[model samples]
Target chain A: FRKMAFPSGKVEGCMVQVTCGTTTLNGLWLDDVVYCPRHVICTSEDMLNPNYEDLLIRKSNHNFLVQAGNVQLRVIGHSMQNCVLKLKVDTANPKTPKYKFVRIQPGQTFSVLACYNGSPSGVYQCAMRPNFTIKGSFLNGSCGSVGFNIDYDCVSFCYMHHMELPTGVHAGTDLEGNFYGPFVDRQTAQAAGTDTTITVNVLAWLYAAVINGDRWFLNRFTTTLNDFNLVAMKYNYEPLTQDHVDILGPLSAQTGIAVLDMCASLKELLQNGMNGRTILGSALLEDEFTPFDVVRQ
Target chain B: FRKMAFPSGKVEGCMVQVTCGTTTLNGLWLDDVVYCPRHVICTSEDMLNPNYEDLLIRKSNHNFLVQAGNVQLRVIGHSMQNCVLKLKVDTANPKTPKYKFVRIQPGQTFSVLACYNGSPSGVYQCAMRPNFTIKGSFLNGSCGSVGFNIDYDCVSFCYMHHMELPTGVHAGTDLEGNFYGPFVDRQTAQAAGTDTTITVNVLAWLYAAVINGDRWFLNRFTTTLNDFNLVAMKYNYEPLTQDHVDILGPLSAQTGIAVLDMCASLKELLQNGMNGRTILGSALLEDEFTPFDVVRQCS
Candidate 1:
């Protein structure tokens, strides 16, 4: 019904437009509740820890060759096409920073320098490195105005629970310029999940997002908690224990029992702990922790 | 996959000229098929069945006020909106014919009078009063254009079955003026469909046209048998049966069971007659008789 006037009279900023034949409604709009400080799990020893960068790049399958002018992030292919690296160089926001994903396909070297969106440098020698090893030349990269001389500290974080994290969460500047996180990543995942980017599309993982939350409009930080156990031996945030209160804030007191539905077997493993005891499988050395335990008040 | 070499293949009549992606493949295109001498069913006995049109309008949950010159399909409501009328009229191709749906809402009077797509006279009020009611209003109420004179034939046929009819059965002619009924409907749904308006926008639907047809592209005279069955104590074509023959023309010897996936509860009903035998739930009076029952080669 193209009912422009809501008979009952006008309501708010976003309701079906006065006269209607389908008004746009986002399926993921949240009612606007303050989310946990961070997705509420995966604690950090020091989010700005300088050494954590060294450790993250070392453990990552794709590492950055952080040489000054020669700065190249060499992606060593482990499982081929699934290798994705999202990193942001010194930024004001932590949840999101100036980030871009580097996708690497197998056998052949595909380079953004070659796939460079911007016009590259002078001819042959600098431009087309022809067939050089490891994702070749000429356009070795980017909206290219090389940061060759720039000393911007860069860091990579994992994908958020809901792919729809409002970039504002990371980049949003409050009237006061408080940093969202250590503009640089403080550490690796507490439970599981590499910052691995090689994967599927949003639609492919949407069901998992909804199954984890019951409500696809997740509040924050948590994804599908089916990945984490009830406890984080060491608290990055607060250890999510049987109380569920730590991660859920309001929801823990609401649902009370098991929540994650995407995978029931994991629900059992999570409640019981993957390695038998909540040692994180290896605890922090395990999988990427994508947890969600929200309950309605 | 027309990979034609001619920067301009004489491209006759209508073949793809080829650039790449997906140009055209007319090898599978049919010349034109006259579908049902009508979408053929919900029989009125006379078809132009004068009395039934009168009865149909009154019995209908909604009736039409088909007056010429004043031809407005005004929709009234409490919900104030959500009204739509889908109608089809005469055309060589039931699809290419002059037709469209009307959308209605409150404080609003939607009329083809406003939506004429064409012009209407002050009163060919003579335009049939020419003789009819509900489905009345055009050609002896013949191919009843009760969507009423105002030039469009406005007939209600099947949800226009596939554009492919078996030209072999059309009541179809070629360059010369021969009638294919069965008339302009010719014979069958083609390699699929095209509005051939020579024109406007379901260039979009044409591609989706074939992707969904293992079933919808059905090679016959029916699109919505379910609708017809609901009203048919009423009949037109004979209810299809395992004639062992007739409509299965080419497929009869093949699938040895029952095939109208459209309805089964009363396939037993049509075979058993509607209630016991032809209820309006018994008017089981009609079936287009497109039945197919097979028995392995010689059994």
Candidate 2:
């Protein structure tokens, strides 16, 4: 493990994620200081539902899988103007594959999807695969780097409240009214690279809440409690509770679920083509990253 | 009466208020628009309460009182970058006193406090006075337009939920617990200019509710409903009711009164001298316009 130096810029207001050796410290840079204030972390026990404002600050422990010989650093411009994100590999360990270097111009954003021999690019499968993902329009391509392919594009990441769909499978509404996604597909497995376990982590809150049958959390889905009960009764999967639905309290519960509807709306608009004008809503995560016009088909 | 031309710059996103002849049009400038959309008006029957977000769009019909002899135009920068508000008077009617012109820089705000002979300026009395007032830090001096006196400063404005204190009065909490403002003061009125009537309007909702005995509306002060009852009983001012308290419904009622405390807090910090740093809260409005430091004592 080697110590990674701080990535440079007028980092004030930028989300700085730095992994030195094995430990990664993520925080917003301000007043030329670096320290994680406890209040900055979103502490909601109900992780399945996240407030839109909290999206800017939430950090999962496994945001970066920094092991020996592998290093990673990520920064996202938050409030600063002309924000940009740059990806630069270390000259000393350019071929190390795990040594990730990123810089950004003011106004642009950059993110990492997967890294390994022959990994897929674009929007990765919407599985239980959790990692640090942000909603951004990353249009530029990467520089020529050796080993492991990097996928980059205007891809959005969403936390699936339902069970993990098989990779390479597309999304559809169930007769039971559940929105199941990324179901099984043999072709997706064919492209899986050998000798590589991709590393990324998303907030476990959303995924955990679904298992617990938190009503407010589950209600955001297209499926209803009665349907979930029907399936659970057959499988003896355990009954979900409306008790936890009040976990976020009255006010927060109201506003939190609003974002789910917003995200779904965005997905619909994207599927139909946004025509370059942006609107709120979470765009449907694609089975594969296809161009805007092509997706309409 | 004369036609007042639209003020210049990218009028988009600016709150433009222009009075042509005797009529005034107040609406946001977007895509070069020049008419009011009915949706822009705050339509809550409960006028005593107002949502903070609605402040940006609510237009009182009397925002500008343009008589046959007077004309006025005002613009506020809303979402435009480098927002500036410029106050320009028409040379054609420079000494008309009533003919008002306003322009803005990319990052500033300009407002009309009062118009006419001998009218005073600065944070005017927190009476039932209404008109257009926005929350902005305006510290620049005027271009010296003649006629009525124009005061420009980092003054705060508020819609008093309590009864109007006499003009030239300051704010203080009554023993009954109501936050009364600009109470009577003989010395304060000594400075009032003769033959001049100040024209400004705040939302009538706040004042009308106090008379109606709306519980939620009247409860934003240090005074309680019982205190109000005691005072009203003595005067036979009609009993107030909690019926209209829910007039704003649940959600708006909760958020609307939050602004009252905010205004009061600002007034306190201002009285103690903000020390050049601003805070939220309606500052204690002055009996008369005085400097920040001197305002700590009675005028």
Candidate 3:
């Protein structure tokens, strides 16, 4: 005989009745013996199946729309180890897509473009390598695609780089007079430690003079110099001394000096119709050879 | 002659003409000068008036249903100053309202009742200052009103007071115990000599033992000295001394001894009715000797 037991407790009047051979069992007959092979079935109206309809899909919107200026594009993802980003204007035409390529590093996001041109009228699509994927991934193995329609009118264009000037040097002036020293004679200054001297470097002094509109220095140098004799002296004496040659490292052996001389000769030839007729006569000589041009000279 | 100047610039084929009066001067023939004002009014035909039909209101449900475990009645605004809040039940009759008065302070918001009773059930209205003049200033002005439908299923009963213990003295056992010394001799110890005598206050220690259910101490004390004998010992010893009496003067003379005796009597009464045998004897003792027994025995 086969029997089943309800360990929780028995529900009265709700138990199954079974008939075996010639004996019929009613209710839960604990001591009654049953037939060798018997089938049993139990049913109750209070029995219920689980309710699974309460589980629902929670809907949510996670989209963000923003308008920004001076934007920089960045590629952020995992699997982009050997990938490169290619930006293009994604219009309807497949044949002509304007593409720009930018390289990116693994585990790092990089800017594709500083500013997008033809903006305010363009739609840009950024694609990733090597298969040129454009959509971003979601947790559930799904992907999302985002497109940016750029408007450049809202972009800021102001960027300034400033450098403050160093101390003691006036801005906008040439290097010579603003930085050079006061010259003194060796004779009286060597004995009594007091000597009188005058300023030289006419071009530099001329610049300083014109900065304050002072014609006094120019008049003094002009009055002191022997103009005609000075020109004759310049023709007679050699301007290139051994010291000058040493400082300039033998002018003929230097490529830069040779080039400068060649340029000067060419300019003179061009100005004189290739005849070399002694241009400006003694005016250049007078300017170069003055008393301040020689002593304070 | 009232002559007016014309504008310098003009469109092509535009000309200005002026007619002089043609009348006979002495024998000359004359005609009247006609003044004509040329005014051109230009208006647009395509301009339309703006539409404002969307600004109109249409009726819809505005009921805000909130389910909460408990609600606190908050009275706010000037109505609290001059008016008394009356909570009413309107489940049976919505119009003929019956209300209970609740107290509130001026310019402040406060809770009226912790829980609402059935007398003020369902869709309650709060009226201010019952039986008063209906002046513009003194009228029962409903500055703001909130309606509550009593959901008894969601209502909760939370006791604001502490619960009482069942027959025990386990009161302050968790606190630290102060010990003086284990004295060499009782007289020298009483004279404040330095000894290793640990003298604990017997009453405080016993109270703590009873409260904490120190069954070992209780069994030892109860076996050696039954409940009546313990009370007699406590009654014989005084909590206060002659120094305390001297400091407090005559007013505090009888209080210490009287209170100690009263405590002893109450303890004796409780011991007599320990198993509910002498319950009436316990009641009589409590009524005569311990009038403040209820407050004193509270946990």
Candidate 4:
């Protein structure tokens, strides 16, 4: 066997097998990625009022995917005429807008780097409340050139950045409800030409917890306790204590077998979908790859 | 009336007039604000090479709106054991990706702050080439957790600060495609009671463009040319010159009817929808507001 390179950890010798509906891919795809989206910046609880004066409602939501929260009001052309533009927030009916007025000029946009905790249901309005002339339209009236300068006619749309139907194998071992694993289950992890075995990222602490008899590692991280025992037990080692046996019992015992929800053996799991449950069983055979002695040879 | 106070910016006696549907609001609601999103910074074009090891494929363009261009690869937990992670980008089938190898660790995220001009079409694998590990996953064989983290297990979403949309009159304008105007047309701008008209944020340059006889102001920024003529004409002004007519045609003759497709006068526009074509026509009335005789009282 060729010597695995340095920094390979115990990963180089690690072998993985994936099987989804009869398609067995002899490997694993351990992925760690979360989809985050464009968010709004606001300081207020439900409204960005009493703080910001102007607003710029983005229309990118037209695409329905890219989402934005609050408004970023950019005032241009104010320098050209040497004038101060005053703006305000206006609602549809029974208006509850707080920060009503603001004085601005051309250039940098103004907005808080947070989000307005308000319910994004319908359209919210932002407008200019100054009476003056712009280009050709007079400052006073119901509809004219000045009041509809385009930028000043800001409005918010109810939306956010999110995935409706996601595809991926993510693990959820924490309280945050944030999925954390891609412990790959099937098809995709298939090996290419010349390669027979794949690699893996072992939790450094998992081994320490079992072999070293130190719970420090497991305590620090978000890990699956039952899953660890199954892997430890696979090595023909009994790491389960009276405490573990009581709450979960033995793997072959009455309640134990059912709680683990695993098949007869770990290898048998490779024939089906590799979800978080069955996955922990078939990975990282560190015991199979150990140091050898020359005298023994 | 008590003095309107300071910082009010000429908004004191400034009244607003509104009349819509059956219920005219006793007051006017003028607003203008845009929503912007926080985004992930990409690493580089195609590969996050030289920056860090692992990669996270951004599903930004899912709807073509997650405008963040650069990539930011954040690594955590390396503190668990003082280790260095070496990685690179790998592709299957016919690999067109280059300079794919890299070495990194956990502490902070690594990124080029440059965008991957390449398409996020299929799986473009970024893994720990030789060996490494992530959390509890191993790296080896056809695939493993060691050599490289999948940057895969690709998923679309489960995110956002969300929103709270209320109703109001908003106008869409400008070249950048930002929305403008709280200019209520008919429904929302119902008058509450008073007659005093509240002043507003002038286009700041529209009147100057017409007043200056140069489209410099409107041209420099995004402006509605045909719509400008409608307002000027309504104010009893003929700011249209030979050049204006040559470009947009006479706001009266052949070009008059088609481009400025209207139901009738500016006042009538309020009865229907207030889109870019008509909403721009009724916002200002500098010509009617006339000089202030307040100078006589102040003096």
Candidate 5:
């Protein structure tokens, strides 16, 4: 996880903290997460005279590979009552034609997407308000329809609580998603390249968290926690808890195997082409030189 | 005769009378008479450094033809004793080797040969001192000697006085020189291509004073009287007068004539290639252009 700060207002004193996470998660696992106080706290009244200038969000590390599932977003702030909530992907358009919208009761958490289909590959936006239109362009080249704003203002106060999703969700990660391993063995590492090895190490804990049903552990663990403490804390959460052994037994047992398969699949996709063996001779190898390697060296 | 005034130092605030004369009496011949007081009364010791810078003399009019007569050149000033007189013709040369000399006693005059052998066919020079030199060199494909001067100073002080030989002096002039008159008759001065009858006139004058009885009138009359008057007036003495007949006699008498027969003989020899005429012709004229008509027009 990478921690970042974002400016929230024009004055020198106004700024917010944003947290980003990159992990080796397979499906529905949050690989890169960003958090900011002003970003998470938004309302319909604020949207009336939208601070679109200060609302800009940028995803810094674009070349990660991961497939997000059941992704959710929430904003909490004053004047949020009767607010139209919206989620946009890839683009900054607040209108519904370029974005998608939902409604949230005052002080209630809003989910931008629930068990959404397909891969979420670019920056996504979550907003709430009377003029709640939200839209985004997909990196896949699909655009939404244009929509008009209705209400001018509304008032309420709330804060973003949390987002939930299924574990080990498997959608093939593209260049924008998280990378797993260049495992020691050919069969286990799947893809074989220097970048694959490096990315695997970078998102190692995220991958482990997803496979063991330890999503809550990732949100709670801070930089202050030791690796051992973090791993120990993972076992105390959700299905990984020993007390939930019977209820979460099968899923828990298959989680690691599924995560490993998904990583292998992703590595295969990165090394080989989408048509499988159609690119057989071009499979990435452990010592293989990537375009970036050529660029660097 | 042009009469002019001169001052005698002994006669305070007083000037002596002087007149130019044509009679060759009292040695007042051409080149013998002094026209200016500076040159007439010498006081400087060095004859070369006479107090006089220039000599006064009568100049001929443009149309005046030079007759067979002498011209006088006089020196004035107190220290004129033992002055080395000199004469130069055509060009001046103040260097040794080519320098020729003539000496003049105080208040005395000398004569020089203006025409060599008494013939005016070529140019000649006579000087009071040897002041020029010459070295041999080739000109126009022929060998000859050229004059050189040692003291570059005194070049301009040297003089050239032309003495033309009279008509019929040379036989060629009588024939070829008078050839144009007949060819283009003086009938209204028109006979040639245009109405201009090219005329040729010949005049002769003595460049140097002639001491011989026959040519003495050339300078004696012009120079002797002037010098005599100057000397007599300077000493507070009365001027002497001569009879008009004596003056008129020398002025009207004819002297000697150049050998035109010899010039004609030479021309015939040149035509016949005799008397080494071929060599002389080739040496002098060679293939040079000699337009008789143009020559006549110029003359």
Candidate 6:
């Protein structure tokens, strides 16, 4: 399998190169479609949010402190041993910003992904602090300038969502940039809602950017969905502002989901007394709202 | 896509069932071929070794003491807090066996996969103490007899391998059942070895059984291989005695690797001075041989 070329023709951007015996096969990425003699190809994309800074700190010899919104990361390097990094949630005059510490062992790196909400929990119908995941593992040959080397990428998002909103829904971005209700159920669910309105989690969309594929998310988000199956939705561009519409125009074309604008339609419907609300079980509150950012500075 | 059935027909033993909107899809297994309307279906199988017992202890009610060869697992159950299990290596009475303790958190189960060598490391060219992984995570509502409930499967093997032999080689199983010498590299690697004598690690084979795939091992082994790519080998049944040959005949047919017998042919080659050896880097030693089993039992 390795010796033979794709009989079809030559492809570009060889993302995967694997050897079996004497022959080596190349998986090329052509227009987002990988033409390789392999199982699956997983890719990712960067996400820049309007609220917080995306942090990627790789300092070896110098000790430095970097901030991603309210999250503070302090790194201390040592010549003999490994470097140390601490995560602290920030506040005025500092009462308790709970700290988490990690040692940058040789041949290892660390990364963190999170969703942060800067506002208080009382402002919205549903409020969450922040939720995040941290991982430390082996590093290849890539190293730092001095000491034991450190490579870390920390991502944080300041976004909000409705508790009752389900996943896979087309969320409406208001003028203020707040994402609101969009929404899964089974067969009974399908018949219950015949409208074209689809709902999705604001956080899920942000997380999906890191691993850019139309229908893929990190394992945590996927596990929350229970399975990897994703239903395609039309990209709605009507509700978006001109800037947003332009930014999402290509994405809408690629993803086929309509950009929803809840500001006018939803507000009008509520004003006309067409408001229909369903209070979901409290067990879902955590999933509904984002948790507070634990490593806030 | 979910609503539509496999156009071919309905198969038996649905291993997967997922709902997509209103329709639901199912993945069935027929003769090891998974005909599912989705991506990949990963499965697992159990490997029973003649050397040591494959442990799958799931005691919930009364306290228990279970032993897999020299590995002793003592479970302490509690009504309020989570249960605890301690693993200890065994000796005649008192000594250091080294203990690794774990708590059976609610909604979580624990499993141990390890290769334990009873004899001293001095007998082999390469030796490792013991390597094991402990993971504590949420369980899917399966409960025990009492206390905080426990679901644990501890697998320990009494096996050894040469440190220098490369992976994917056809190891020869001698009369005493000891396996030896089977080996890989890349382009240079392919050109160097052309003989029909394919080599594989005994540990690799044992580990593969737990996954049942002819070519699939755990992620760790796959990582060691550097890729999931595998070059199939013939099952060398000619190297085994009657019983062993029968045991491996079907496997050889499925895997296409000849079961090798080093007892006669390998011994003869060495005795006749036809011996040729390759001394790999010492770094390769850990991947070569089975490590000592961490937990042991006395009482």
By TM-score rank, best first, the candidates go 2, 6, 1, 4, 5, 3
Evaluate chain B of model 4: give its TM-score. 0.14
Instruction: Give the Å error, residue A73, model 3.
Output: 90
Q: Assess candidate 6 and give its lDDT.
A: 0.20
Q: Candidate 3: lDDT of B164?
A: 12
- Predicted chain A of candidate 6: TM-score: 0.17
Please state the Cα-based DockQ of model 3 relative to the true two-chain complex: 0.00
Cα deviation at B243, candidate 5, in Å, is 99
DockQ score of candidate 1?
0.02
Superior by TM-score: candidate 3 or candidate 4? 4
Question: What is the Å distance of residue B70 in model 3 from its true position?
Answer: 17
Best by TM-score: 2
lDDT of 2: 0.23
- Per residue, candidate 3 scores C-alpha lDDT tens digits across B102-217 of 22111111111111111110111111111110111100111111111111112111101001112110000000111112211011112222111011122222232233343222
lDDT of 6 by residue, A97-143 (tens): 12222322111111111111111100011122111111111011111
The 10-residue segment with the lowest total lDDT in model 2 chain B: B1-10
Candidate 6: deviation at residue B268, Å? 4.4
What TM-score do all the candidates reach, one by one?
Answer: 0.16, 0.18, 0.11, 0.13, 0.11, 0.17
The lDDT per prediction is 0.20, 0.23, 0.18, 0.19, 0.20, 0.20
- Each prediction's DockQ against the real complex: 0.02, 0.01, 0.00, 0.01, 0.00, 0.01
Model 4: CAPRI class: incorrect
Better of 2 and 5 by DockQ: 2
Error of 2 at A276 (Å): 30
- Candidate 2 residues A1-297, lDDT tens each? 000111111111122343422323333222232222121222344233434244333444333222222334332222111111121212222212122222221111222221111111111112211121122211111100011112221112111111112232122112121222332211122221121111101011222222223333223334454554444344322233353223223323433543233223323332354443321111112211111111111
